[PDB]
Swiss-Prot record, chain A:
GO biological process, one term: sporulation resulting in formation of a cellular spore
Free-text function comment from the UniProt entry: Phosphorylates the sporulation-regulatory protein spo0F and, to a minor extent, is responsible for heterogeneous expression of spo0A during logarithmical growth. Also phosphorylates spo0A under biofilm growth conditions.
Cellular localization per UniProt: Cell membrane
Protein name per its UniProtKB record: Sporulation kinase D
Gene from which this protein is expressed: kinD
Traits of the deletion mutant: Cells lacking this gene sporulate normally in spo0F mutants.
Keyword Lipid biosynthesis carried by entry: no
GO MF annotation: an example: ATP binding
Upregulation: Expressed during growth and early stationary phase.
Domain of life according to the entry: Bacteria
Keyword Transmembrane: yes
Species for this entry: Bacillus subtilis (strain 168)
Any one annotated GO CC term: plasma membrane
From Swiss-Prot, chain B:
Cellular location(s): Cell membrane
Name recorded for this polypeptide: Sporulation kinase D
Name of the encoding gene: kinD
Inactivation phenotype: Cells lacking this gene sporulate normally in spo0F mutants.
Parent-protein residues present: 38 to 243 of 506
Function text: Phosphorylates the sporulation-regulatory protein spo0F and, to a minor extent, is responsible for heterogeneous expression of spo0A during logarithmical growth. Also phosphorylates spo0A under biofilm growth conditions.
Lineage of producing organism: Bacteria, Bacillati, Bacillota, Bacilli, Bacillales
Quaternary assembly: Oligomerizes, probably forms homodimers; oligomerization is assisted by FloT. Interacts with FloT.
Induction: Expressed during growth and early stationary phase.
Amino acid sequence: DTIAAEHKQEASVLLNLHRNKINYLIGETMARMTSLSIAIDRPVDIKKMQSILEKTFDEPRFSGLYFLNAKGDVTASTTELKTKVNLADASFFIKAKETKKTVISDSYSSRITGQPIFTICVPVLDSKRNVTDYLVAAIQIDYLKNLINLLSPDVYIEVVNQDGKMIFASGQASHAEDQKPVSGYLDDISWNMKVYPNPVTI
Amino acid sequence: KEKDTIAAEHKQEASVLLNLHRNKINYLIGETMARMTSLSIAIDRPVDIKKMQSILEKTFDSEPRFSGLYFLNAKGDVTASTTELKTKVNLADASFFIKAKETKKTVISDSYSSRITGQPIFTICVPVLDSKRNVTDYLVAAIQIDYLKNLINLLSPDVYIEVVNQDGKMIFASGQASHAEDQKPVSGYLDDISWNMKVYPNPVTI
């Protein structure tokens, strides 16, 4: 009756390891892109940028690294493209352009690779603080799931956005039966993580 | 006998603080490695020293974590520095430099007293490589030990926490040892350095 309250906190423990893992991953990525922005010679030479992105990508975290011009055209790209791609219609792009600040997108299906991702988009400013370009880092949802799964294969964990859209779930739902989850939002993106304690069992 | 039930709870709290505090340090160290690594990739050759000086200043700004950021030539001369240097400074004799040069990979040093600032620090050193994979320069980021200490202490004033390297050197300690009396610590190593953090449970009372 009180191995209950322990299975509970054991799940609070899982919750924070996993949140932290994801927050770290996101923060580390933001910081990689922010540093690139600062280090690179302006105006940005597209050939050098291409090379930089490739060196940075060659990290299965990424679906890809991309560079955008003011219009939204993909001018540098880890993934070879058959046809020209424009990311302007993209929500994160719009938000990035208006705020002139880094943006973390909700999960979606990459127009470029076709797989579920989320993107970190960092605008590049000139001297007068106009947005001239964008660094774009796309991470596979797949990667996040697997990171969670390796740590806790046998324990159910559900991640859902602010509107109840399933981002992903790790482990077997059957483990959640009769259990209330210990839950919590991530820092940089409005994803709520729900960890289900295991049953009391002897 | 219910004593042992409050004790288990105090122990559990110790483990929670242990994980909380390592993560904070791990993140700090990991993010710094990432930044230095990106700088090392993004800089155009031949490296313009004034541009590099400017990048380090920007990277350093509003980041009390750092004791300082520095750039080294292949010999180990500090050629750009967020600290105003009064003499020429060479680090070729530093352990982290020797390891960096030989491994050609990032090095996280043990703690030591900075030649430059006199304070206790540890440094992250990223070698910058040639097309030919020859080391031409070094990025060096120094982190104030006391920044970490005060970070932890602010969060957990009432809990005694020691961090110790492999050789038993005390890196830092936070809190009052009186709060650990008759306690065994819950312990664990940092991911990027061989530092062991020992978090002591509080004693039971009421």
